[PDB]
């Protein structure tokens, strides 16, 4: 974004999908543990069962489990 290697708007929308899924990746990994801190004793494993699908997504997208190396320089991986 600094040296202006023009990122297409389609790849930009792909990155938007990424970012708005990471919003979920944060919402779960807070609320679940937040439920396990506030007093909600049972739903701990519940939110992990919900999150299981994001694991398959991050795996099949670019990387092993955290989707590592989904951002190259001239676009994405």
């Amino acid at each position: 974004f600094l040296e202006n290697i023009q990122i297409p708007q389609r790849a930009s929308y792909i990155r938007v999908i990424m970012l708005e899924l990471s919003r979920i990746a944060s919402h779960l990994l807070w609320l679940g543990p937040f439920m396990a801190d506030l007093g909600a004793q049972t739903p701990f494993f519940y939110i992990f069962r919900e999150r299981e699908l994001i694991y398959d997504l991050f795996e099949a997208a670019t990387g092993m489990r955290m989707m590592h190396n989904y951002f190259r320089i001239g676009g994405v991986a």
């Binding site: 049972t42 494993f45 519940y46 069962r49």
Partner: protein
Amino acid sequence: SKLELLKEVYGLISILPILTLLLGITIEVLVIVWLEREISASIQQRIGPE
């Protein structure tokens, strides 16, 4: 004669039923911990202590 005590040496008490209660309560402790570790962590989870 009856110098100190004829029938009162040690033969008036039996410790069988007390030990049966001990065995029963220990077995029931096993049952209840099995109940816990197999129902609490298995409502929406995997099986307990397999």
